[PDB]
Structures are given as structure tokens and as C-alpha cells.
């Protein structure tokens, strides 16, 4: 029996900064050898879908893997929700930053939504070392099984 768990937020930050994932998701489920706190790199993995660019780690026991999929999402006017390729319908306006909630929609769980200004993200997850890139606003949302992220952009500058 396989289950899915959303990485803890600190793990998300570690992956964004170093492309290194920590094992032993918290109760604990060790991947192998019962040791933990090992910075494991993410491999480019094998192509699955024309859009997904999945980066995995593994490539009565319990096996733990750590995936970072860069999918594509779409939204329609007036941009009150967006749906990724693998389902994942989110009731958050893609251009909703952290001030314009009366000019954009936001209906997801307010206790699981985080926006970080000037966030640093590795250019490529596959490469063990990459040139860190700064983004004006990056929004994170924690779900039951995964955590979604998406750069926030001005509405009147990308939509016509």
C-alpha cells in the first residue's frame, strides 16, 4: 500500500534553496537503513508527459521518495481559479498577491496559504548546483498530499 504526503514547509524551503530533500517524513517512516537527515539530490528522472518535468530522488518495509513536478496550469477570465494538468483545481486567483483580495478571488484554506516576497529558487532541480534566481512573489499552498507553488504576476501585464 502506497500513500502520498505533503512535504513539511521547511523541506520545501530546503528543496528550493539547495535541491536537496530530507528523508524520514514525520511517527516516522524511514526510507532505508533507518538513518535520516541526508541531503539527497534530485535527478532529472525519465520523461512521462509532454507537460510534466518531474524530478524524483529514488529514481513490511517503507520506501520514501521525494518528487518535485513542474506542471502547467490554466485559468479563464475573470481568473478566480486555476487547474493543473494532473487535476488540482485551486480556488485561488493566479494574480492574487497578498493585498488585492477584494479585487481577486481566494477561497482555499486560509491556514495553508503562504506568500514569500523575493523568494530564491534553484534554476534547475536536476543539476546539483544551479544559479539561484530571485522572484518578486512566490505563493505556496499546502494540500492533503502535496504543496503547490506558483509565481504571482500582475493581471494587467500578462493578460489582454
Amino acid at each position, epitope marked *: 500500500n502506497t500513500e502520498y504526503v505533503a512535504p513539511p514547509m521547511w523541506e520545501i524551503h530546503h528543496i528550493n534553496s539547495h535541491s536537496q530533500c530530507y528523508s524520514s517524513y514525520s511517527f516516522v517512516a524511514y526510507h532505508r537503513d533507518s538513518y535520516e537527515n541526508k541531503t539527497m539530490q534530485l535527478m532529472p528522472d525519465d520523461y512521462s508527459n509532454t507537460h510534466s518535468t518531474r524530478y524524483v530522488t529514488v529514481k513490511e518495509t517503507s520506501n520514501l521518495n521525494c518528487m518535485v513536478t513542474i506542471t502547467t496550469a490554466r485559468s479563464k477570465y475573470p481568473y478566480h481559479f486555476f487547474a493543473t494538468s494532473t487535476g488540482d483545481v485551486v480556488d485561488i486567483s493566479p494574480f492574487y498577491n*497578498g*493585498t*488585492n*483580495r*477584494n479585487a481577486s478571488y*481566494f*477561497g*482555499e*484554506n*486560509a*491556514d495553508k*496559504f503562504f*506568500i514569500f516576497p523575493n523568494y530564491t529558487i534553484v534554476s534547475d532541480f536536476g543539476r546539483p548546483n544551479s544559479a539561484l534566481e530571485t522572484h518578486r512573489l512566490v505563493a505556496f499552498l499546502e494540500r492533503a498530499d502535496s504543496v503547490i507553488s506558483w509565481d504571482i504576476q500582475d493581471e494587467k501585464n500578462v493578460t489582454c
Partner: antibody
Framework: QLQLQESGPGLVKPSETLSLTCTVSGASIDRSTYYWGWIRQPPGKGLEWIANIYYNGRAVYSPSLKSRVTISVDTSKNQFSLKVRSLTAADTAVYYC????????????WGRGTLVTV | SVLTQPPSASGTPGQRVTISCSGSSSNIETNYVSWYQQFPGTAPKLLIYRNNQRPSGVPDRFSGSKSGTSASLAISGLRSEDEAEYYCGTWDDNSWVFGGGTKLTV
């Protein structure tokens, strides 16, 4: 388009508690809202935060008013009410119904407060 | 955990006014500090949400800074309509502590 209004009594006496109610229009209390709260202000004095309440019923009070203050929320009517016990002359103030709407802003929307004289 | 905000401040049109809030070093030090503007006889309004950034619609004349356990609100080019009561606000371990309240006078 959040809108907050108050419907508390205009006159009170120390012999009874004070019950205030804040009603929300243009939106609804739900898991998509961060928190609401009550902030009092004596005439000519500084603002005083009484307590905050969340959608799931969790309430965090101020240590100075924790004993004499209770707060509840009715999601069916999209309202939340505050009860203050053992009123004194110092409680004559304008009570505001504040909340958090935007992510960064914090205390952003302030309902038109009601004057209560002890 | 009061912020020991001064009772009032004075200034002249075209001048810069600085308002200072002194923190407990356990709430203002780390928890974000916000500045609120309240005209007399009406509910207050958010003026500076985070320590540095400025909300939409607020004039650029307002600025905020947080050095150590002290918070400073700077107003440049003082005007007639700027007269109001300015409040500090911050979190103290699940407790919101407003400032004392400064009545700006021109």
C-alpha cells in the same frame, strides 16, 4: 467586498454583562478567512485589543481581559458575538469589530464601532 | 507589553515628522510591526502593513523602519490633512498589542 456592522446596545449598567454582535455582509465566515476580533477604545485613549476568534471556534483572548471576556461565532448567520462580564466605569468606550482579510495587511477591515456607556 | 508610545507630536507643513515606538524586545523585535492611522470620530485605517512595505493607495510620503526594538514612522512633506492619531501594532505571542497613540499636530 467585506462589510462589518455592529448591533450592540447603546446603554448598559454594571449590574449586567455587555453583549455585542458583529454581522458580516458581502462575504461569509469560512475556512478561507483568517480571523476576526474585537478592539475597544475609550474616548480619547488608545486602542485595546480584546480577543480574536477563528472560523473553527478557536478563540485567543488578551491576558488582561481573559477572565471577564468570552466570544462565540455563529456561522449560520455569519455573525460573531462578544460578552464582557463585571462591567466598570472604565468600560465606557467605542467597540470596533476588526478582522484580517488580506494575507499581508493583518488588521485591515474595521467595522463601524458602537458606543457603550456604563 | 505596552509600547510606551509618546502622547503626541508636533510639526510644520513641508517638514518631516518622526514617531517612535519602543518595544519589549520580545514582541516588536521579531513580530512584524504595523502602523495605523485614525482620524478622530471614526474607525482607524491601515497605513503601513509590514515594517517596510506600503499598502495600495497610501502616498509615498509615509515610510516605516524597524531598528532593533524601536519602530520609526517618518512623514515627509507634512500637510493639513495629515493631522490624525497614529498607532503602533504588533504581535506578542498570540497577543496583539497596539501602541499608545500619537496625536499629530501641525
Amino acid at each position: 467586498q467585506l462589510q462589518l456592522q455592529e448591533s450592540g446596545p447603546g446603554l448598559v449598567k454594571p449590574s449586567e454583562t455587555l453583549s455585542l454582535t458583529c454581522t458580516v455582509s458581502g462575504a461569509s465566515i469560512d475556512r478561507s478567512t483568517y480571523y476576526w476580533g474585537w478592539i475597544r477604545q475609550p474616548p480619547g485613549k488608545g486602542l485595546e485589543w480584546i480577543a480574536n476568534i477563528y472560523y473553527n471556534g478557536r478563540a485567543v483572548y488578551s491576558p488582561s481581559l481573559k477572565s471577564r471576556v468570552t466570544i462565540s461565532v455563529d456561522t449560520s448567520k455569519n455573525q460573531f458575538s462578544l460578552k464582557v462580564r463585571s462591567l466598570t466605569a472604565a468600560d465606557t468606550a467605542v467597540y470596533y469589530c476588526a478582522t484580517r482579510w488580506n494575507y499581508f495587511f493583518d488588521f485591515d477591515y474595521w467595522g463601524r464601532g458602537t458606543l457603550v456607556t456604563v | 507589553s505596552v509600547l510606551t508610545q509618546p502622547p503626541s507630536a508636533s510639526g510644520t507643513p513641508g517638514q518631516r515628522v518622526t514617531i517612535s515606538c519602543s518595544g519589549s524586545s520580545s514582541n516588536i523585535e521579531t513580530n512584524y510591526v504595523s502602523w495605523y492611522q485614525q482620524f478622530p470620530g471614526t474607525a482607524p485605517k491601515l497605513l503601513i502593513y509590514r515594517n517596510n512595505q506600503r499598502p495600495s493607495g497610501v502616498p509615498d510620503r509615509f515610510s516605516g523602519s524597524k531598528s532593533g526594538t524601536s519602530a520609526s514612522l517618518a512623514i515627509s512633506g507634512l500637510r493639513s490633512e495629515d493631522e490624525a492619531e497614529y498607532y503602533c501594532g504588533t504581535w506578542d505571542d498570540n497577543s496583539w498589542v497596539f501602541g499608545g497613540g500619537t496625536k499629530l499636530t501641525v
